[PDB]
């Protein structure tokens, strides 16, 4: 029931991509923010997204790899051993009883 | 400048107010929220306020003593000791890349 993240795949080639499934998704939704890391930190924030308007925004983290999805999910392309490592979710609702999740993945080389 | 919170006094006497000043706003906001400590955390938001709308909501530390200004200004009235420490702001702006300023006091008898 509650907010979580799921990379797939777990482990992931470099050069690849990885998908961050958002799973249990609440209501009263404003918008997204994602992060590197374990916690809300603007100083790692990767991108915002406003639901109603359809508007991301690169944050100091923003590599130019990633797609956001309506549903709150995160893809990052063309995988480097540096993108391994933990991701945060902060759901910004209208009632600012936000909600944060964590999710992770690893990253390996090819050949 | 950077968005950076002063807490007049920073030295407050028990059963008197405090008021966290909020310097350097960004514009173009969403609205914000105050937390007891250092980091963003559900569940020690104390109060939030949407810009625009007709109220600002109470989080799971609030304690009935609190009030958010609409540029972003944090009044505590009626002290205690444990009110004493760190709180942070969490700046939500219109495109949704966030910002945070962490500020203190001291609670003196
Ligand atoms: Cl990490
Ligand atoms: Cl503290």
Redesign the interface.
């Known amino acids: 029931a509650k907010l979580t993240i799921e990379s797939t795949p777990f482990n992931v080639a470099e050069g690849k991509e990885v998908l961050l499934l958002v799973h249990n998704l609440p209501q009263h939704l404003?918008?997204?923010?994602w992060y590197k890391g374990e916690?809300?930190?603007?100083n790692r924030?990767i991108?915002?997204?406003?639901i109603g308007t359809q508007?991301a925004?690169?944050?100091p983290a923003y590599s130019g790899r990633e797609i956001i999805y309506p549903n709150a999910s995160l893809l990052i392309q063309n995988i480097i051993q540096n993108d391994a490592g933990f991701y945060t979710l902060?759901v910004?609702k209208?009632?600012?009883?936000?909600?944060?999740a964590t999710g992770q993945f690893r990253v390996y080389p090819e050949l």
């Open positions: 404003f918008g997204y923010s916690r809300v930190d603007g924030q991108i915002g997204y406003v508007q925004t690169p944050g902060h910004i209208s009632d600012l009883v936000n909600e944060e």
